[PDB]
Structure 1
Amino acid sequence: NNNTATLCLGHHAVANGTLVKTITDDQIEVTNATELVQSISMGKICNNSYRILDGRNCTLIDAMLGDPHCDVFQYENWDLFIERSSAFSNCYPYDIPDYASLRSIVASSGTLEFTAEGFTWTGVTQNGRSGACKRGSADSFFSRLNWLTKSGNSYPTLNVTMPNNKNFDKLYIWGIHHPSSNQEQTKLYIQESGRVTVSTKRSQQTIIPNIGSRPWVRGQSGRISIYWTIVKPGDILMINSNGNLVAPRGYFKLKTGKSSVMRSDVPIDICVSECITPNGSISNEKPFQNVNKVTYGKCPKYIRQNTLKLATGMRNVPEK
């Protein structure tokens, strides 16, 4: 027919569509879709967006304390500290009350900037050392801690002051030594029992030692418990002890920080990615991720689904 035409309206389709989920349909085919869930890591932790520190065989605390094999980390600072699982302590055995909170505070602040200070320890021997804590091939000790003992036949009451004239909080790491026997307590410290009282205008922490055997660790049936005290601008640090003091040598600086600490065992490498997980860095194109709930940086949100396809085309209705 020459005096009629035909005009049909339509829409496109594709040979290969993709299935998506809607409200009314469990599955339904669209021309195109895009994946909104990051389920693949890069295999490695990328080091060019944020400043990453490989902890190697050192925990962040052992680095802070100054375990001799952790000396390469003196004064290091980071955006993210990576703790390996094969990390081990290799100095005098210790325990830290509320370990997690100190690790967190150090992780958070993001630095191990240590400033030594002029402590006067009248009437005692300083720089006490030990076979448990070899440095060189010589007995030694945690480098940031000063293990004090008797001089001649005395250990007079130690009463020292140290004010904070800075505009930042100082953090002091100190300890108390718990000896293995009365035979040792007296030999080292003269007095039959120690006392250690680290105080400020606001806070105070006394600790008494506790003689007795603990399990053998690197030659040691005794222990050192580690404590910390923060000192705010204008405040003042006071230490009072008539035995067993593992003293501080200085302070760490505390910063309002963006820093943190992660536990991973994956290789650090040069790439670029602004999201880090223990499985390695992951891309952050997508809004969600299913790699790990532990993240650091600009990260997609963790969720329990591994796939979420968002339709980026119309419904696909093929031909024949």
Structure 2
Amino acid sequence: GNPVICMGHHAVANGTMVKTLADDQVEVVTAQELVESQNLPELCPSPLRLVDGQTCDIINGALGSPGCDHLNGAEWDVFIERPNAVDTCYPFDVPEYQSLRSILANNGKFEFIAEEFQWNTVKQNGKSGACKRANVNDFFNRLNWLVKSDGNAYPLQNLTKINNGDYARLYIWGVHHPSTDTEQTNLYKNNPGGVTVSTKTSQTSVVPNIGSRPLVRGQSSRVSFYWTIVEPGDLIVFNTIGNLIAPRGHYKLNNQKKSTILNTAIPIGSCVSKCHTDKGSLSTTKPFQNISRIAVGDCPRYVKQGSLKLATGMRNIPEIAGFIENGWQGLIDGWYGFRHQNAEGTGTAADLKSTQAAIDQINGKLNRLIEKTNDKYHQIEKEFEQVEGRIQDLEKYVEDTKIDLWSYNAELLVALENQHTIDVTDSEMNKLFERVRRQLRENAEDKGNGCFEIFHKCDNNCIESIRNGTYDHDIYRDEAINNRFQ
């Protein structure tokens, strides 16, 4: 009725606060941050193929503006478009600009195929001061500016190209909009001009609009660009009585389009990463990030929270006595253990089986806590220079809805896991204490502070027998029962 064995668990000076279903803050021994808030100051060029547009945005790249030669034959997973790209050529607009941009970026390559168009008596290769290469008048190198012959003739053009190949073709073509009627007749003789571009299933007809626009690089006239896709087995007809800016061929479309585009000033560095934000690449294993909604590749999911702490250890209770409202700051060899006092003194030893059992249930979630890929490439635009209305509203609302739902999932998840982690480790403590209860049987009594008063001689070999589960209660039974009741 003198030796005492105690059951306890580790503790630390002070640990980390986390969130559960119940409490707002519960202190625990160890915790891990789940939200990435650090980004590299650069974009990583591997394992994804990044292509830098430099002074050239993707549209001018497709058109073949001065400055964009370095993009011929390029292939990308991610086109890096620079916010300070500048127009260097003839002033132009693109009805449905964003859509052409999406198609080009998504396709993932600038593989251009020349074709000779046997245009009639019209002069070809028109050039301009608004589009100089060095100081020489030039034009978009994928386009061919047709004007009237020296004989003041511009006859009806009528050319056909059949796609009997195994890939869809992208034709880019334009319509010139002169500033005055004299300009119209000087260039194209006919007034009005006109363009019809047709496949078997679709047709685009364009009437030039004559009139003065603001001066840009010396020009008040404009080109509007359009595009036509021609599937294998389809064909394209170009029809014009003037103002056509002819294609010089076509781009090849990949059957499967898996590329995308990222607009950022962030430089391309030397690192390795599969995750790219417009702030730079991510290098992390965390399941969430608060850096940018604009994330391309294999990325953590974007959430609003700055921090989410996942408990990786038990509740931390600080400060001859086992668990009850006590933790052993001395126990540094395990999560649970034994603390005794017999004739030969005291001693603190860790319990392995219960420590391991706790660990495999808390770091059982290890593995499942970033399960899933989230490998996304082409997505949608998520920032805008100016309001445009209905379509943009919808894009903003979609992304906002997404972020709120994932932010919520992240909040609930951590709370649920922490609740479970707390419950598992409290349960493993009780299980240990109960296991000991069942070995001692009637040779001991529950002190009430996580300790057993052992009612018999128990030397260190006997103490050990308890810890490694070999203690036979019958050996000490009648010795013990006597000390208990008489």
Answer whether TM exceeds 0.5 for this pair: yes
Code of the residue aligned with 2:289 in structure 1: it is: Q
Measure, in 2, the Cα distance between the counterparts of 1:204 and 1:33.
62
Measure, in 2, the Cα distance between the counterparts of 1:274 and 1:104.
21
**Residue in 1 aligned with 2:196?**
197
Code of the residue aligned with 2:309 in structure 1: it is: K
Q: In structure 2, the residue corresponding to 1:265 is in which secondary structure?
A: coil
Aligned 8 A contact 1:284 1:298 in 2: no
Measure, in 2, the Cα distance between the counterparts of 1:284 and 1:55.
27
Code of the residue aligned with 1:126 in structure 2: it is: Q
Higher helix share: 2
Aligned 8 A contact 1:107 1:260 in 2: yes
Q: TM-score, normalised to structure 2's length?
A: 0.65
1:314 lines up with 2:314 in the alignment: yes
* 1:16 Cα offset (Å): 3.2
**Residue in 2 aligned with 1:275?**
275
* 1:73 Cα offset (Å): 1.3
Which is higher, the Rg of structure 1 or of structure 2?
A: 2
**Residue in 2 aligned with 1:84?**
82
Measure, in 1, the Cα distance between the counterparts of 2:85 and 2:102.
17
* 1:15 Cα offset (Å): 1.7
* 1:4 Cα offset (Å): 2.7
Aligned 8 A contact 1:49 1:272 in 2: yes
**Residue in 2 aligned with 1:303?**
303
**Residue in 1 aligned with 2:26?**
28
Higher strand share: 1
* 1:137 Cα offset (Å): 1.8
* Unpaired stretches in structure 2, ≥5 consecutive residues: 320-328, 330-486
1:293 lines up with 2:260 in the alignment: no
Measure, in 2, the Cα distance between the counterparts of 1:217 and 1:137.
17
**Residue in 2 aligned with 1:134?**
132
Measure, in 2, the Cα distance between the counterparts of 1:241 and 1:312.
72
Q: Aligned pair count?
A: 318
Q: TM-score, normalised to structure 1's length?
A: 0.98
Code of the residue aligned with 1:171 in structure 2: it is: L
* Unpaired stretches in structure 1, ≥5 consecutive residues: none
Measure, in 2, the Cα distance between the counterparts of 1:210 and 1:162.
27
Measure, in 2, the Cα distance between the counterparts of 1:73 and 1:28.
56
Q: 1:114 aligns with which of 109, 112, 115?
A: 112
Residues 20-169 of structure 1 aligned to structure 2 (within 5 Å): 20-151=18-149, 152-169=151-168
* 1:284 Cα offset (Å): 3.9
Aligned 8 A contact 1:275 1:284 in 2: no
Measure, in 1, the Cα distance between the counterparts of 2:116 and 2:167.
19
Measure, in 1, the Cα distance between the counterparts of 2:202 and 2:15.
68
* 1:122 Cα offset (Å): 1.1
Code of the residue aligned with 2:173 in structure 1: it is: W
* 1:283 Cα offset (Å): 2.1
**Residue in 1 aligned with 2:213?**
214
Measure, in 2, the Cα distance between the counterparts of 1:12 and 1:211.
84
Whose RCO is larger (CA < 8 A, sep 6+)?
1
Q: In structure 2, the residue corresponding to 1:45 is in which secondary structure?
A: coil
Measure, in 1, the Cα distance between the counterparts of 2:270 and 2:164.
42
Code of the residue aligned with 1:170 in structure 2: it is: R
Measure, in 1, the Cα distance between the counterparts of 2:4 and 2:31.
34
Measure, in 2, the Cα distance between the counterparts of 1:283 and 1:15.
32
Code of the residue aligned with 1:60 in structure 2: it is: I
Q: In structure 2, the residue corresponding to 1:68 is in which secondary structure?
A: coil
Q: In structure 1, the residue corresponding to 2:273 is in which secondary structure?
A: coil
CA RMSD of aligned residues (A): 1.0
* 1:295 Cα offset (Å): 0.8
